[PDB]
Design a binder for this molecule. Structure first.
Ligand SMILES: COC1=C(OC)C(=O)C(C/C=C(\C)CC/C=C(\C)CC/C=C(\C)CC/C=C(\C)CC/C=C(\C)CC/C=C(\C)CC/C=C(\C)CC/C=C(\C)CC/C=C(\C)CCC=C(C)C)=C(C)C1=O
Ligand SMILES: CCCCCCCCCCCCCCCCCC(=O)O[C@@H](COC(=O)CCCCCCCCCCCCCCC)COP(=O)(O)OCCN
Ligand code: SF4
Ligand code: SF4
Ligand code: SF4
Lengths: 177, 101, 78, 103, 153, 129, 122, 178, 24, 37, 318, 382
């Protein structure tokens, strides 16, 4: 059948000044010179590139990057140890141990998110009742050694105080959703 | 002489795009949670979907039942047959809307 | 010829006692071996004499004397 | 392969079949993974037989079928260079425990 | 004095930090994010990074995605045939540490079990800029080498 | 006259009606070997008779399709030949009849499924032409 | 200038028409060149450490404005950074010697390696 | 449903459902014969084995349940023929009917251990090469038995020692009152 | 080798949608 | 001829080589003897 | 001697051609190429080099040093010695051979040896068959380049390259024989590998397709060779067809007409065309490729020798 | 003659480990090796709640993320009977279709980069980095946007996302045209693709292809026309269906399916009802942050939905959507508990990569990468 299919698909283009049109396209590349022309148009157009360290790609306040334990404006870690994020975590990155502090109000003696064992899905930010754990738009925390990448119990996730100026902004703009 | 019929003039470089950066609340969104009829009327067993379903009726068929059914099925007249999902192919270039959707 | 070497390979077998081994010894009667050990001894026969012993016949060697009368009759003896 | 093991007899027959297969395949095993110097053919036959005998008390035919299938899988993945060789060389009283742990 | 040694180390490090071609073990999506970090917007050919398709000539190896227990021997065999001034970047949670699949039987708990790692790009789907910043941290790790000063002890 | 079935591999058959008549007569003749009081034989007999009838009445393949609304006559031939295979297969390992115990538990869960979930909708009826 | 050895030249080839919108404490000069063209390339930062620069030196007050997540220059979010618990940035000292790098509380490099044994020995 | 009237009653042996996709929980012996039906049949034309889902019920006596999905591109319908075969019951293979069943049955045997009869090339597809154990069972622990793999003095080699990891924390969320 | 060579001839390009363009 | 067009369509480069070459085997064949003037 | 003044600048040319290709082929893809290393990536070639030089070997293996440690030397020496006869301006050829063109043909016929030997010393069946396929391709588009040069030779009097570029004072052979330039370029693309025609150079199959003992020097020398062979085979599409060092001859007041600058401009055009045509076109698979050098560029090259011989014999234009 | 054809270009086809039994250059059989990317997904989901199960789906197919979350959501609404709003359906399709575009933009030009065309890759990836400005804006993560939750969808679009998706759709016909003008006309493309991996329809049905490899062969079968699982029964779009089956038809489809997906995006934009974002059933949808803090009964559900889960009733369904790769279906047996029970994931690429054995018989060794191209083989699903 392929023999007859070939015979007919070549008897479709079989009238002079059509065999010539197709011959010219093969003889002088026409489809290919339309490839080169487009490629040239893009060789001369402005470049969609970004010299990274100096300017960075667009993000959104919902962007999920480095996890940060938030604080209440008046100190006092926002993280009451409900363990909802430890429960909701799909990868079980967060290990929370709780102890009634001397003040009497519950708090987490151990709040260690394992960033390497963490999927950055933002479930912890949703599950936390008081917005205690949020993902700071950092996303730039590549560490030379794996042990540093395991974020310690409430000490490095407490560096969100530096990122609060941006985390509070993102929360004030996302809370409408 | 290329793919530029006054239509590639929609070029990729936008230069005016996301003019209102996302975390800037010019308009405070509202994102309704519940329909207005279901704010002060929280009766649930009517609205329930998880548990508001008929129970599973798993009843056994013994040989008597199926021989009765086989004898009851006298003939397979048309419309006792599954309908075919008829789908043919038809050449079309840009006629749907005129290429503009 | 073949009898000496089949005797030696039954002797040196890691699951027998060289004493009870004899040109009349039997794998189940006088050697007290399992059928798996019989098939293992047959494998030893066909790797020491390079023969391609079919399984349908290999099953039927139950004593060293049958091992002899089956290692001799191979026209492809090695 | 259909489980013709409607009885222990057919299962034992195909056990002997698999045993003959592994034994007659030991040459390529020794060749591909280079055990012809560390291990003797007597020792590899010994190990295959100790495997087939370690699981000889199986009054169930289908369990023997599945054991022979796992064995054929192991062999076929040893014959070809699917698994490595440093395991093939490895594949071939109360007080002394108490001093170590509690379990 | 030592100044000549300091400058020859600066030069060697500038070379190894300018042209650092990684054998991109692009397993899974972090290879799709790595492809975005090789794409038009965040150039990696800008920083010299040229994605080599062979382990033979490559300064780095950006393992990405879930290192499966079956792709562990292949990753090790590839890492063993890189020229000695090599580094490894773990990209994505599954590649750097156990990740979403830490407790999966078939997933190694981080490539740090197979190859020695030098910069772990963090974030399970790292932003393409985040992998780019991980590479700009590998560049720092080069700039802290001073191999000549150590060859002179 | 049919140029080609859009489907690849299902080559257009010029003598569609003739081979369809052949296949449906073969099917009617071969189905006689299954017991009569089996739903399979009632079904085969009924639809094979309907398609053989509409194939004998109409002449063009297009009219066969139009009246017998079952796609294309090439796919119809595929169906008829596959049915012949099945009847020649069913003769072997005969499954007809019901053993005495016959425990068959029909289970019905009637939970409605939400409309916006994949639900296999019926599709166009043979008024497509 | 005087750096023909970096892509810092690409940033300094910017700034030709760009306006300078604020400068944070560390010296990073935050520029904006909008209107002209090439969305996504209309906000950057000149790190004021022409060598030894890297990302994450951009404080949180600006790391919003500079990734286009917001439209609030760091001179506007500096009235929102919390005074009581506010902490300066730390540049992500990853690898630059111990006591700058971060350490868990058992790493044996961390001063005060805690013991986790829940049972209190006798 | 038309398919239940024509089908020999013995073939749909044990069960039959009527929602969430209809199923014919059949017997393992009549399975490939049942898969021969529903395919190469004029009014039931499936032709497309979408999936072969091993399902493990430890509390049953026939542990596994090889759920053959089946799409009918012709009549636009989907039928889920099932079976039940425990750990040591070789079940009929339908690679002869739908050749896509090859890899799906390799995966069903790999994950579960439901060997397939006269299936050519029935070899562990997903798990590791020297993998012993069947993962997607229930009694197979999540973290695996011996499935850590690290480099060592046996250079260029990743060993397969017994496993040790941060203990998977199983959370007993399930609440009373269902 | 008698293996079937990939013949780069075929039928001309004609976009083939489904029959549900206007009225299903 | 129908088969000629079928040959200059299926194989353009051996049918426009036996014609970019005819103009070379045809010019000195007839066009040169014509140039007797 | 003054061979330094033609090898060192050519070494710099190849080193900067790796950057020119990456950068042009990147600009095509809407992205700046190497741009951080130097002011504009200008130091990126030196960075690639100084990296490859400082990379420890994978295995010393200095024992096998006469077999394949001089085969890349041979390939590179050939790619560099075919530059003698190439004239950059009137009286700037290093050695005006009165049979210059045939000497280039012979240098190619020895590059075939270079490839075959450097592939046979790699004891890798896949890599050796790849090198043999690459040699058969480089030598199958050499009969087509041969006949194309016979065309441009019929137009010219002699094989002297300075004459072939002096025979174009009236018109470049690119204007009348444009169809031939397209065939010489599409052959020089295929003679060298760097082309739409590089299945043996499919990104992976290239590295594992030339040698087993890399040590970096082998990798750089092959690429330095491929890029010099490319500068050369682009310095031939500009002697033969384009006017070797000839202006358009309008004789401008703004332009003082330097020769070597015109040769440079034209070889830059053909190098940019090498890059552009690498970016914009898919690979040919080496099974349609060899069926394009025999069934397409040999008939269309033979026709051209008969066409440009006929049309020049009838009317006495010879 | 056996050849261990591995990943030619890593980072494009990651763990591809074919073992080709060749005949010179003609391939006689291609034996793919799976498991190199076999993460314990079909086991790990049995151990986590129906919410924790969702992030695995965006990690099942890594080039078309939200289509699998949409196939899972529709398998935990098939059981839950959880009626989702109209806006959730329209957003869910506007992102399943943006995902079809995100996949065809990759699976065309990664294929076109394996064939050799280097530039379509980078143009399509600039387009994909425009669409990830929508993923990353609507949910948070550029690739794994755990956004299409079981009841409805995670959270409403930002207040400027439809304007930007429009400003993208206006300029996306031109990008498809460029990807087309650069590859469709080329004689080096057609030659590399025409009559490559031709699959007669009986073969595409037998081997359960059910994707863009079932509409190459000409089988008009799209599970958006067959089993309309959203507003798809309202949205107008034509399913392009091939006529030869060769890898040049599947490319032409994937480049038209990338235009009909543009039609569906423009429709979902022009008709997106301002309704609730999640199902009103707050025992299947965690209440908003504002409500759970102010309402005690919402707080209890936010606690028992982010720790306990749904506990979807006991059933077993096979919900299959038309993911870009093909018919991605998740057979979800559900014990009554809050954790699924053998959430089996039928993923095309497990059925397609089977087809490599017969697709690439007698094709030249350089075609075995073109076949892997047009199958859209992403090993996360395999
Ligand atoms: C097909 O695809 C491919 C790609 O894809 C895009 C590629 O990228 C590339 C391109 C990449 C390569 C590295 C190819 C090889 C090219 C080079 C290594 C460049 C060669 C450069 C030189 C000739 C320079 C050599 C040595 C130098 C510069 C240093 C010598 C002197 C000193 C050390 C002193 C320096 C000190 C001072 C102060 C300056 C003087 C290849 C090959 C490829 O195959
Ligand atoms: C409009 C100007 C065109 C300029 C193009 C410049 C491009 C230069 C850079 C390289 C472009 C891309 C290279 C592609 C390589 C493959 C080209 C090829 O071989 O294409 C076809 C052949 O193309 C060529 O050979 C082109 C060479 C043109 C030479 C001249 C042709 C005839 C000239 C007629 C002269 C008329 C006047 C003479 C007498 C008065 C092969 O046939 P096919 O398989 O594609 O399809 C048909 C199969 N039977
Ligand atoms: S995003 Fe939060 S909840 Fe999810 S894995 Fe990471 S730490 Fe756990
Ligand atoms: S971070 Fe949130 S969920 Fe976790 S313990 Fe603190 S308040 Fe509870
Ligand atoms: S760590 Fe996350 S993003 Fe990276 S490969 Fe694993 S699942 Fe994908």
């Amino acid at each position: 059948d392929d023999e007859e299919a070939e015979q007919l698909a070549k008897e479709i283009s079989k009238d002079w000044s059509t065999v010539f049109e197709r011959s010219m396209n093969t003889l002088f590349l026409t489809e290919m010179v339309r490839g080169l022309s487009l490629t040239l148009k893009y060789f001369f157009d402005p470049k969609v590139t970004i010299n990274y360290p100096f300017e960075k790609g667009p993000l959104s306040p919902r962007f999920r990057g480095e996890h940060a334990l938030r604080r209440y404006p008046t100190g006092e870690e926002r993280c009451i140890a409900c363990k909802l994020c430890e429960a909701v975590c799909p990868a079980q990155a967060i290990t929370i141990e709780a102890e009634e502090r001397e003040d009497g109000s519950r708090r987490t003696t151990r709040y260690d998110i394992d960033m390497t064992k963490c999927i950055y899905c933002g479930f912890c930010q949703e599950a936390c009742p008081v917005d205690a754990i949020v993902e700071g738009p950092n996303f730039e925390f590549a560490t030379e050694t794996h042990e540093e990448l395991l974020y310690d119990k409430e000490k490095l996730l407490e560096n969100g105080d530096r990122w609060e100026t941006e985390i509070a902004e993102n929360l004030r703009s996302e809370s409408l959703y | 002489p290329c793919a530029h019929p006054e239509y590639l003039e929609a070029v990729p470089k936008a230069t005016e795009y996301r003019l209102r950066c996302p975390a800037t609340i010019d308009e405070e969104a509202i994102v309704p949670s519940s329909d207005p009829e279901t704010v002060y009327n929280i009766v649930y067993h009517g609205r329930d979907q998880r548990r508001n379903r008929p129970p599973i009726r798993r009843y056994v068929l013994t040989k008597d039942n199926v021989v009765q059914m086989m004898n009851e099925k006298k003939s397979f007249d048309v419309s006792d047959f599954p309908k075919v999902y008829l789908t043919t192919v038809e050449e079309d270039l840009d006629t749907r809307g005129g290429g503009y959707e | 010829a073949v009898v000496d070497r089949v005797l030696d390979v039954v002797k040196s077998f890691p699951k027998v006692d060289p004493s009870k081994v004899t040109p009349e010894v039997h794998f189940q009667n006088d050697l007290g071996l399992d059928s798996l050990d019989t098939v293992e001894i047959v494998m030893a026969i066909e790797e020491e004499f390079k023969l391609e012993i079919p399984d349908k016949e290999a099953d039927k060697i139950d004593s060293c004397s049958l091992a002899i009368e089956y290692v001799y009759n191979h026209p492809m003896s090695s | 392969v259909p489980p013709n093991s409607a009885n222990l007899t057919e299962a034992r027959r195909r056990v002997f079949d698999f045993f003959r297969a592994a034994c007659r395949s030991i040459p390529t095993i020794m060749d591909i993974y280079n055990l012809q110097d560390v291990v003797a053919p007597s020792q590899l036959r010994y190990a295959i037989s100790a495997q087939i005998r370690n699981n000889a008390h199986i009054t169930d035919p289908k369990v023997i079928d599945l054991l022979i299938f796992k064995g054929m899988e192991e062999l076929t993945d040893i014959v070809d260079h699917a698994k490595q060789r440093h395991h093939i060389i490895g594949q071939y009283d109360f007080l002394k425990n108490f001093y170590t742990s509690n379990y | 004095a030592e100044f000549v040694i300091s400058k020859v180390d600066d030069l060697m490090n500038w070379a190894r930090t300018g042209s650092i071609w990684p054998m991109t073990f692009g397993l899974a999506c972090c290879a799709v994010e790595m492809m975005h970090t090789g794409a038009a917007r965040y150039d990696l050919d800008r920083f010299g990074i040229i994605f080599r398709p062979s382990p033979r000539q490559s300064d780095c190896m950006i393992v990405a995605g879930t290192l499966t227990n079956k792709m562990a021997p292949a990753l090790r065999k590839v890492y063993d045939q890189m020229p000695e001034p090599r580094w490894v970047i773990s990209m994505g949670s599954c590649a750097n540490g156990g990740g979403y699949y830490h407790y999966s039987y078939s997933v190694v708990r981080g490539c740090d079990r197979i190859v020695p790692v030098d910069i772990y790009v963090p974030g399970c789907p790292p932003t393409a800029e985040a992998l780019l910043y991980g590479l700009l941290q590998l560049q720092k790790k080069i700039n802290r080498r001073k191999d000549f000063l150590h060859w002179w002890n | 006259v049919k140029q080609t079935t859009g489907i690849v591999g299902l080559d257009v058959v010029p003598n569609a009606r003739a081979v369809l008549i052949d296949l449906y007569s073969k099917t009617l003749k071969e189905i006689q070997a299954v017991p009569e009081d089996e739903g399979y034989r009632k079904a085969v007999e009924s639809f094979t008779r309907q398609r053989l009838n509409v194939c004998k009445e109409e002449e063009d393949w297009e009219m066969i399709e139009k009246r017998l609304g079952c796609g294309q006559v090439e796919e119809l031939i595929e169906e008829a030949r596959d049915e012949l295979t099945l009847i020649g297969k069913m003769i072997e390992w005969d499954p007809w009849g019901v053993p005495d115990d016959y425990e068959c538990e029909v289970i019905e869960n009637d939970a409605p499924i939400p409309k916006h979930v994949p639900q296999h909708r019926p599709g166009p009826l043979p008024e497509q032409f | 200038r005087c750096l023909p050895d970096g892509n810092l030249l690409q940033t300094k080839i910017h700034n030709i028409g760009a306006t300078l919108v604020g400068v944070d404490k560390f010296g990073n000069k935050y520029y904006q060149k909008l209107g002209d063209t090439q969305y996504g390339r209309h906000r950057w930062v000149e790190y004021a450490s022409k060598d030894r620069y890297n990302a994450s030196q951009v404080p949180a007050e600006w790391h919003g404005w500079l990734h286009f997540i917001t439209d609030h220059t760091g001179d506007e979010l500096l009235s929102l950074k919390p005074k009581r618990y506010g902490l300066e940035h730390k540049e992500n000292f990853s690898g630059e010697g111990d006591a700058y790098i971060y350490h868990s509380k058992g790493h044996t490099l961390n001063p005060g390696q805690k013991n986790w044994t829940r049972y209190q020995s006798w | 449903k038309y398919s239940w009237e024509t089908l020999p009653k013995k073939w749909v042996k044990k069960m039959e459902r009527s929602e969430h996709g209809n199923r014919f929980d059949t017997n393992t012996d009549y399975l490939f014969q049942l898969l021969c039906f529903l395919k190469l049949h004029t009014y039931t034309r499936v032709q497309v084995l979408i999936d072969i889902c091993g399902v493990d019920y430890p509390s049953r006596k026939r542990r596994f349940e090889v759920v053959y999905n089946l799409l009918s591109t012709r009549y636009n319908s989907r039928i889920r023929v099932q079976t039940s075969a425990d750990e040591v019951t070789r079940i009929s293979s339908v690679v002869s009917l739908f050749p896509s069943a090859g890899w799906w049955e390799r995966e069903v045997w790999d994950m579960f251990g439901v060997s397939f009869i006269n299936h050519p090339d029935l070899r562990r597809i997903l798990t590791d090469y020297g993998f012993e154990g069947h993962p997607l069972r229930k009694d197979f622990p999540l973290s695996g038995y011996v499935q850590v793999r690290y480099d060592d003095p046996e250079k260029r080699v990743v060993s397969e020692p017994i496993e040790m990891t941060q203990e998977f924390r199983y959370f007993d969320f399930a609440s009373p009152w269902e | 080798a008698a293996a079937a060579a990939a013949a780069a001839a075929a039928a001309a390009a004609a976009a083939a949608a489904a029959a549900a363009a206007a009225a299903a | 001829m129908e088969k000629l067009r079928m040959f200059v369509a299926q194989e353009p480069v051996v049918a426009a080589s036996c014609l970019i070459g005819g103009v070379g085997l045809f010019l000195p064949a007839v066009v040169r003897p014509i140039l007797d003037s | 001697a003054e061979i330094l003044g033609i090898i060192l600048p050519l070494l710099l040319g190849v080193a900067f051609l790796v950057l020119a290709e990456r950068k042009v082929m990147a600009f095509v893809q809407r992205r700046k190429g190497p741009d951080v290393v130097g002011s504009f990536g200008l130091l990126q070639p030196l960075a690639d080099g100084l990296k490859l030089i400082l990379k420890e070997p994978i295995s010393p293996s200095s024992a096998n040093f006469f077999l394949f440690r001089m085969a890349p030397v041979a390939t590179f020496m050939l790619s560099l010695v075919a530059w003698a006869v190439v004239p950059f301006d009137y009286g700037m050829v290093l050695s005006d051979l009165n049979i210059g063109l045939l000497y280039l043909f012979a240098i190619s016929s020895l590059g075939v040896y270079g490839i075959i030997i450097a592939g046979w010393s790699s004891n890798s069946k896949y890599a050796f068959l790849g090198a043999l396929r690459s040699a058969a391709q480089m030598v199958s588009y050499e009969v087509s380049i041969g006949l194309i040069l016979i065309t441009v030779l019929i137009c010219v009097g002699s094989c002297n390259l300075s004459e072939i570029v002096m025979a174009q004072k009236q018109i470049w052979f690119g204007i009348p024989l444009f169809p031939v330039l397209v065939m010489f370029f599409i052959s020089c693309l295929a003679e060298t590998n760097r082309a739409p025609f590089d299945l043996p150079e499919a990104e992976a199959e290239l590295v594992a397709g030339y040698n087993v003992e890399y040590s970096s020097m082998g990798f750089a020398l092959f690429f330095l060779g491929e890029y010099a062979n490319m500068i050369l085979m682009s310095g031939l599409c500009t002697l033969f067809f384009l006017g070797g060092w000839l202006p358009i001859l309008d004789l401008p007041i703004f332009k003082k007409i330097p020769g070597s600058i015109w040769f440079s401009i034209k070889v830059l055009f053909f190098l940019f065309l090498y890059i552009w045509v690498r970016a914009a076109f898919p690979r040919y698979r080496y099974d349609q490729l060899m069926g394009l050098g025999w069934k397409v560029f040999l008939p269309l090259s033979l026709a051209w020798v008969v066409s440009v011989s006929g049309l020049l014999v009838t009317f006495q234009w010879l | 003659f056996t050849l261990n054809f591995g990943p030619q270009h890593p980072a494009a086809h990651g763990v591809l480990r074919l073992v080709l039994e060749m005949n010179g250059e003609v391939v006689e059989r291609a034996e793919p090796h799976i498991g190199l990317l076999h993460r314990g997904t079909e086991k790990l989901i049995e151990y986590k709640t129906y919410l924790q199960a969702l992030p695995y789906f965006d990690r099942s197919d890594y080039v078309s993320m939200m289509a699998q979350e949409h196939a899972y959501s529709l398998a935990v609404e098939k059981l839950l009977n959880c009626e989702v709003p109209l806006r959730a359906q329209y957003i869910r399709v506007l992102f399943c279709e943006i995902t079809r575009i995100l996949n065809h933009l990759l699976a065309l030009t990664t294929h076109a980069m394996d064939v050799g065309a280097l530039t379509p890759f980078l143009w399509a990836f600039e387009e994909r980095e425009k669409l990830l400005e929508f993923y990353e804006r609507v949910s948070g993560a550029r690739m794994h946007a755990s956004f299409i939750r079981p009841g409805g969808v995670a959270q409403d679009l930002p207040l400027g996302l439809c304007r930007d998706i429009d400003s993208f759709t206006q300029q996306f016909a031109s990008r498809i045209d460029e990807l087309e003008e650069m590859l469709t006309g080329n004689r080096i493309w057609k030659q590399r693709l025409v009559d490559i991996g031709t699959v007669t329809a009986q073969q595409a049905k037998d081997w359960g292809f059910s994707g863009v490899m079932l509409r190459g062969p000409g089988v008009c079968w799209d599970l958006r026309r067959a089993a309309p699982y959203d507003v798809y029964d309202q949205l107008d779009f034509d399913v392009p269906v091939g006529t030869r089956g060769d890898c040049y038809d599947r490319y032409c489809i994937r480049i038209e399916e990338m235009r009909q997906s543009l039609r569906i995006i423009v429709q979902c934009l022009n008709q997106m009802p301002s309704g609730m974002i999640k199902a009103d059933d707050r025992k299947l949808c965690p209440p908003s942050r504002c409500r759970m803090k102010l309402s005690m009964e919402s707080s209890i559900h936010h606690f028992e939905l982010y720790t306990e889960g749904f506990s979807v009733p006991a059933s077993s369904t096979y919900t299959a959507v038309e993911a870009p790769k093909g018919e991605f279906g998740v057979f979800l047996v559900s014990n009554g508990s809050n954790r699924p029970y053998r959430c089996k994931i039928r993923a095309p690429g497990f059925a397609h990569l089977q087809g490599l054995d017969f697709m690439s018989k007698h094709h030249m060794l350089a075609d075995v990468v073109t076949i892997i191209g047009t199958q859209d083989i992403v090993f996360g699903e395999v």
